[PDB]
Design an enzyme around this catalytic site. Sequence first.
Site, PDB file in Angstrom:
ATOM      1  N   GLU A   1      -3.469  -8.698   4.423  1.00  0.00           N
ATOM      2  CA  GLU A   1      -3.357  -9.193   5.786  1.00  0.00           C
ATOM      3  C   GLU A   1      -4.680  -9.577   6.396  1.00  0.00           C
ATOM      4  O   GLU A   1      -4.697 -10.245   7.434  1.00  0.00           O
ATOM      5  CB  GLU A   1      -2.702  -8.145   6.697  1.00  0.00           C
TER       6      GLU A   1
ATOM      7  N   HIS B   1      -4.129  -4.386   0.886  1.00  0.00           N
ATOM      8  CA  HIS B   1      -3.599  -4.998   2.097  1.00  0.00           C
ATOM      9  C   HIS B   1      -3.877  -6.492   2.092  1.00  0.00           C
ATOM     10  O   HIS B   1      -5.037  -6.896   2.208  1.00  0.00           O
ATOM     11  CB  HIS B   1      -4.227  -4.392   3.349  1.00  0.00           C
TER      12      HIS B   1
ATOM     13  N   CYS C   1       0.801  -1.232   0.000  1.00  0.00           N
ATOM     14  CA  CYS C   1       0.000   0.000   0.000  1.00  0.00           C
ATOM     15  C   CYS C   1       0.834   1.282   0.000  1.00  0.00           C
ATOM     16  O   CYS C   1       0.325   2.362  -0.313  1.00  0.00           O
ATOM     17  CB  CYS C   1      -0.967  -0.019   1.199  1.00  0.00           C
TER      18      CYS C   1
END
EC number: 6.3.4.2
Lengths: 559, 559, 559
Positions: free
Chosen positions: A528, A526, A399
């Site tokens: 995650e 992202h 990002c």
Amino acid sequence: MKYILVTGGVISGIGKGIIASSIGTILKSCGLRVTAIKIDPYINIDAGTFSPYEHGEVFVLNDGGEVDLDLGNYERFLDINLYKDNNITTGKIYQHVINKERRGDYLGKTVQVVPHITDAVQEWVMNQAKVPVDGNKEEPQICVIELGGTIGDIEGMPFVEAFRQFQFKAKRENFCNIHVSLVPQLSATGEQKTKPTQNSVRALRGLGLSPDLIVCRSSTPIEMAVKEKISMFCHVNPEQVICIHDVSSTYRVPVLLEEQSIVKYFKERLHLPIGDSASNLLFKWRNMADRYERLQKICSIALVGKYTKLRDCYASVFKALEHSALAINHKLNLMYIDSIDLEKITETEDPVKFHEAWQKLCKADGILVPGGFGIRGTLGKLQAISWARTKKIPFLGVCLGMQLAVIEFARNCLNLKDADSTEFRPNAPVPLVIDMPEHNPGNLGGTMRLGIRRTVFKTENSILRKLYGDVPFIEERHRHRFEVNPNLIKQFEQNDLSFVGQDVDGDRMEIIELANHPYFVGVQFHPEFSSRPMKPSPPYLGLLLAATGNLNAYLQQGC
Amino acid sequence: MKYILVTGGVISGIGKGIIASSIGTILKSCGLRVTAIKIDPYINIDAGTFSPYEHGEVFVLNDGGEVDLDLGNYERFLDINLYKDNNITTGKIYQHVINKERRGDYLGKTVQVVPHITDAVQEWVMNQAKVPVDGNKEEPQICVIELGGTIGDIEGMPFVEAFRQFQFKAKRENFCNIHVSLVPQLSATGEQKTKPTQNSVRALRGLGLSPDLIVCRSSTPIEMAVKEKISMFCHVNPEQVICIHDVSSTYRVPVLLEEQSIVKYFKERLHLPIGDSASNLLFKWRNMADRYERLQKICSIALVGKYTKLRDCYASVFKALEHSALAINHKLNLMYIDSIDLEKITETEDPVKFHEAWQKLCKADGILVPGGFGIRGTLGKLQAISWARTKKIPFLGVCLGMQLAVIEFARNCLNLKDADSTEFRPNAPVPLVIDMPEHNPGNLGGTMRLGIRRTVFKTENSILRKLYGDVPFIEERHRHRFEVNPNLIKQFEQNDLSFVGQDVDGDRMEIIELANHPYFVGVQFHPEFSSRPMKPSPPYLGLLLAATGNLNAYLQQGC
Amino acid sequence: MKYILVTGGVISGIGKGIIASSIGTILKSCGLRVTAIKIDPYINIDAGTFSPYEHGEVFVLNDGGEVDLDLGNYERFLDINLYKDNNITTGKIYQHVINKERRGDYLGKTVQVVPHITDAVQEWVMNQAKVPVDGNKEEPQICVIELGGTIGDIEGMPFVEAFRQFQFKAKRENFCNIHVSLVPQLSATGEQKTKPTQNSVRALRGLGLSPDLIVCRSSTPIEMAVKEKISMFCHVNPEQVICIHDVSSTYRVPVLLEEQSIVKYFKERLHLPIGDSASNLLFKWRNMADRYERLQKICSIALVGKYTKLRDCYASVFKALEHSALAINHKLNLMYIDSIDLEKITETEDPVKFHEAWQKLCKADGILVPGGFGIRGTLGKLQAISWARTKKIPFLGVCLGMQLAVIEFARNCLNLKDADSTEFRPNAPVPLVIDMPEHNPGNLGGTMRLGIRRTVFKTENSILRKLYGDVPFIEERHRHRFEVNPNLIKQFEQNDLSFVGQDVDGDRMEIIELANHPYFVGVQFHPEFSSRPMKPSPPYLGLLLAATGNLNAYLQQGC
Ligand SMILES: Nc1ncnc2c1ncn2[C@@H]1O[C@H](COP(=O)(O)OP(=O)(O)OP(=O)(O)O)[C@@H](O)[C@H]1O
Ligand SMILES: Nc1ncnc2c1ncn2[C@@H]1O[C@H](COP(=O)(O)OP(=O)(O)OP(=O)(O)O)[C@@H](O)[C@H]1O
Ligand SMILES: Nc1ncnc2c1ncn2[C@@H]1O[C@H](COP(=O)(O)OP(=O)(O)OP(=O)(O)O)[C@@H](O)[C@H]1O
Ligand SMILES: O=c1ccn([C@@H]2O[C@H](COP(=O)(O)OP(=O)(O)OP(=O)(O)O)[C@@H](O)[C@H]2O)c(=O)[nH]1
Ligand SMILES: O=c1ccn([C@@H]2O[C@H](COP(=O)(O)OP(=O)(O)OP(=O)(O)O)[C@@H](O)[C@H]2O)c(=O)[nH]1
Ligand SMILES: O=c1ccn([C@@H]2O[C@H](COP(=O)(O)OP(=O)(O)OP(=O)(O)O)[C@@H](O)[C@H]2O)c(=O)[nH]1
């Protein structure tokens, strides 16, 4: 619906979410559909405007979340993906109530904190438990409710009274109460005290809630003399005192509650439908407890963040990394490197902190550049990618690195040092990264790109495409404002660094790979927030595979 | 009179007495006369009937004290010897008040907790501060008042209201307030919380007392971000937050407050007469800080008690021992040996705990048998003296060993195995140790021997006489009921174990020495309650001298 | 055993005992055996040393009570006579506990307010409920427990925690809870507030007790808008809010609870054995409600006390008088006359208060001289008997008047003005009333005469003997120290004032009557503590009969 309301003990950072998820994820292994509602006493609505050093990183939901975190922990442990309206903050309630007394919907009656706020709380928790949250289209049967914050302060006053009225409107078979307190011992001496738990109960019972269980989390496992005092003073039987000590990894936390027999408790307390097996699934929780004791070559990243010491600004990445380290049977050695400590300026004034960063970055078998904002760190991180570019140590940009890797590549190969992102200086002679927020119907002005977005892989020569499973499109989430100009692609239509992904229309690219390198990925999304202990994040899994060199060995199997 | 009222933080065992004495003993180095009053919320009057495993050992005062302890700590640190009427317990007040409403001295008015108890508290603390306590016949100028216990519970309710009224009846220049709280951190993680201190202040300020200082005792030294939060939330300026970490020895605790500049604080707060020098006496507090870092041969006792793990049942002896270890520049290695672990019965059923005791007692360069009661341990300790008797390792018997050493000696030398003390079995064919409490005018029935008692050394060949300074009589204190029969002396009028001391009249002996041994002493008096960090206890000082062999070398100087 | 625990609302003087007795005496009409235990937070043990202006007059029990009062109210309403060990005061508990920690009966453990006081409270209330209290030799089935005092203060802290632990050790079917609060309205305006009841509940629920009923006593009957707010805010259904307004006589208080249907409540709550009839006994409670509305000739005493305005120093007499006024269908007009206002000294300095007393005493159709002590009033009351002696208005002397009537009679008839009681001046040339406390085995020194004592009527010509029913002996109770000398009887062995009663042996006389008078009685015993609304006190019943002249008319029936 059966409701479990955990609370808080003396200090905030006990492990509230590690208990509420664990008693949730035991019941998910029981065969029950679970939701989660986190009550937050902090006035601020929509956490996304935090500096991430006070609380932690954000989490991002599907519908546009900017929700705290602890919420992230529930998502990762339960297979649940959530909605933004069960991050029920104090500012969410008041903005729901101040926007109703202009409507006149309380029929001219003056609204006060009791009951007209606490009516709005026990309507909010009824509705978010009612909505399904998982892949089935069906209402769940439990709802683990996390009353965050501590208890006794001024912020937590409209909420414990909101659930005191809720024990009467619900049935006693439909309600539970956990209290997760601290028994602090002083290494200075050696005894172990029970007083903080006593005063924390008589602040809970003094507000009209009684603990079913009582969970004493501390450093060491506690003796039966301590279980006798908590049973006698806090007025609960000794079958409801559950010890939990500081364990090395959080996967012991579900299986440690199995030994203390809380599974058969809620059969008797909550009167929920259950038969007993192995009290969790034997293949997927007790297995990875033994994976973390018996370990191997300590390897597999250094990290360049922009912060001092592990405040959880990057705790939402470290839990995704050791998901991948759970897959490759390696101990992980997360070491922070401040991007200040790679600047020219620190070496001029202090070489103790500067030379300390390089020492770890040259021995680094993998770099990781996660997201960030502002002028801090950015000028320091520009050297970290080029260090990884020439000497070919693999990394992932998340990002911000995807912005920064495209900046350095035109500066190095194309010798266009004048180019930079329009994040920092608007006087850009080569504005290589341009601002373009989504101008959508229903979204006025500049709105940050947010939520689940489809992005399709264009061409075959992606090492990422084989990792997701050669599907054409992937579904990820991100919160960022800036893009490389599609006009500025003309500068790199021939090099080894070419853009791979495209969304539905194709006005941005979101994904880079470099040819003459082992593993060079940079993504705008992202990766995650979908990482689970069963299947890791597909960019992060290959990143540890490139660190151990088995990245080719993973694709030898295929098939 | 200037009054300092310390209180309590979250848990009880912080170190209340180590702070209240330290701010006392700074002011004693300032040139001010100090008293001490310990407020105790525990109902039990006259602590002497405790089992010493709940709270700790007793202390013994001059006039007949059986006072807790913490009181002992003040005595040892300040050169003060006390009276029994400033151990002001809750049961002391009520027995002072229920014995007045039968007198009718409240003029028929119904007495309630406010004000007629809190009037009796603020008359008690006025009188005990008024009486002199030291060698001068003159009223002091400060009075460090220890409100023991914690704060917020039901026991501490009649006392904080008793001192809330006391801030008005006193002047604001005459009153102070310390709050000694805990900031617990979890080694489990790494952050350090300030929440327990916030809730402990708003339970103190919510009862009408405001902290002047605020003392945060924890494990690690705390960062300036923590001093900012406690200054902003607990509403006191950052010059009144004083950190104190877990230090190795308690002598750092006075000199660590010197660095944080609390000496000049009470000049401005309390308006007390002071000029500044070195803020403590440089020769006698900062010196013995450096004695404890730089150390030497780890030696110099094993201890046979009768308890499990160092609950402070013997903390009033261990502070007397390292007084002597402060004199001989040796690190001390206190190792407990349970007298259960020397019995015949443990070796039959468990050799892991039994063989573990012997291992340390055979390598022991010195034994120590302190006081105790009951059948537990006694039959185990009978072998420990005879092990020290034949193999000639020195020890000291304190209040029970002096009984037990005279028992074993007739059993070994005189072959009178039938003899025993009349503590345990009254059917004694040879009652070698007989009961005889003091039958005094003003003391009805059997009253335990208690208080300061003169005891004169008879003859010259005592190694104890040279240690006290060859004075004929010594002045010590004890709490015991039993004596060897003066008729039964006839059994030992010829051996190497002869009785040395005699009191004013001569009906008991109180002291033994053995000839064919390096150092064999057994005393009825407790020689722990006069031991100070400047001059150690004269029996205990020679006992470490016998352990290092320099006991002859101490008397080579003389002179 | 089923337990009902009433408490207290905002202010102390609500009417606690009028509710706890009423819910007791409903259940006595239900056919249940009742006890009563009054918890008192005032430290003073054994109320008998009160000045009676702080709290009220004493009550006197059988075994030697000096118990407050409220206790008296239970005795009078329930047919129960009590024991002194259920006046469980705070000073009774501590003297029970401080006298056990010298015994060592807590096994050396340090006793604190929780649990070792609250264990002693819930053993005291178990034993006093267990003992029978009425004419049957059988354990009762309910026990109306009065937690006196208010709630929230420092005195009431060891007790509400003592009953919070008691809800767990008892069963929920065995426990109840009443809360008798105030809804104060300001006549100044007109609205009626509910806020004081809300804060008084969240101080009760904040200490861990929940009201079953909630009783709002006020001035006016309250509207259904007030019953809705108390039902919604205080979180109890509208069937448990019971209004009770300020009624004229206390006999409406039992029958007003019948209309609000609390009889069938405890059938459902407490699960007690009951069938329904007329919910009280129709002949003896609803009858005397109508006796107090419809009334007659306002007559029938003035009273000479020694106090200002009707603090209940004489409320234990006024309830005995209107027992007799319940029998003769007369309204009673109790008017106080201060004995200061009959002195020579007030007429010299103020005739507004003096002439105001005489005005009522000359129109008085009956005088009453109740008990008292000290020099105040005594010299004033000496003229009141002689005013009643010559002009022949009837009166009764109670415990002081019997002393004073024998003093004036030798001064008037025998012209022995030198004689006086030995209460005041020991230099008595004619000591007509001598001190002689009971010198009993088991009672050391001077002990006040106390408890039930048999006293036999000697001879037939007593108007009291026909009133009790011509039994030879009566059984009454008194607390006084002084007697006329049996030697000094020789002075009056011929007059119209002769002594009538004698006890078992005959060393005192206790009772006088005068011949040439309508009704002249003076008694040493207190005839107030057996007076019930069914049968009045036999001296007081004739005293109102002499006031209306029907005293001869009562003995015309006989028979
Ligand atoms: N059982 C455990 N043992 C050791 N550490 C733990 C345990 N559970 C959680 N932690 C760590 O402590 C931190 C606090 O846990 P968690 O985030 O669940 O609390 P929280 O209540 O969600 O925090 P917040 O109140 O800020 O939302 C986490 O960052 C986690 O890494
Ligand atoms: N500064 C310090 N650092 C480490 N340990 C300490 C310190 N001060 C005291 N201690 C240890 O902790 C224990 C508690 O200290 P202390 O006895 O002064 O508290 P206290 O309030 O007197 O205890 P109590 O409340 O039982 O009377 C002591 O036994 C002592 O050995
Ligand atoms: N229902 C009622 N209406 C009007 N007055 C009442 C009522 N009940 C009691 N009283 C009067 O108010 C006074 C207080 O009542 P009561 O003595 O029962 O309270 P208490 O709790 O026993 O008092 P204390 O707390 O002092 O023991 C009594 O003297 C009585 O005369
Ligand atoms: O999960 C949570 C729970 C609570 N909170 C919020 O944290 C506050 C409690 O915060 P803390 O108890 O952690 O104390 P503090 O922030 O003031 O200072 P530190 O101890 O962190 O150094 C509460 O007011 C609540 O609003 C979170 O931020 N996250
Ligand atoms: O110095 C003191 C202070 C206080 N106390 C007494 O200790 C009580 C507080 O005791 P604690 O706070 O230590 O808790 P606890 O004894 O119930 O159990 P542990 O944590 O010790 O295992 C208080 O009620 C007070 O009466 C002492 O005994 N010594
Ligand atoms: O029946 C009772 C109940 C309580 N009390 C005792 O009365 C105290 C409460 O007394 P109050 O509430 O009546 O206030 P006060 O006496 O201080 O002053 P006044 O309002 O009476 O003018 C309590 O502390 C309790 O010990 C009684 O004397 N009799």
